[PDB]
Amino acid sequence: PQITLWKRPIVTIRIGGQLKEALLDTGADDTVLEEMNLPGKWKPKMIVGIGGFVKVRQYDQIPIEICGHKAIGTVLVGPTPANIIGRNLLTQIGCTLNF
């Protein structure tokens, strides 16, 4: 699709057999989801945003779908105020910025 930017680029994603809303975020290297459960082993990671450093759990090889586009990727979980789809997945599904 083409996603315009006068409103937040919120889309529907699928993870862990559930549908959620997430922000398509070109300014995030990595994908971060608000607190939830994911299966198996996770490493702790540090990310930096505005406001400073946040400790999150990194899950590898997580099946996920973003507007009908399927992928398996790394997904960080922790205290973010918004589900965020970052460049690791945006590139995978072929997303570009155009003007």
Add this chain to the structure above:
Amino acid sequence: PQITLWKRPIVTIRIGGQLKEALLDTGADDTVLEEMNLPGKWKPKMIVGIGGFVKVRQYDQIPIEICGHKAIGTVLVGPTPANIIGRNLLTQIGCTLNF
């Protein structure tokens, strides 16, 4: 242009007669630049990011150019780890996300 996302979508902007690099950030409602001096008067504002709330200065009607595209808009200045161009300007210059 078309800007791909396997690397950070960093572009050249012009503001206050200087060229700087900035992140095209679909996940930022607003444009925030690292500390700099800008003409005239400013209101304080609070923004939220992944690590919490940050106090910034809001300058209105700032002439700016983003990758060859000229505009006048709101620009916030504050302690951000990166120059970021948010949806206020991205929409103006006709940015979309496409996949």
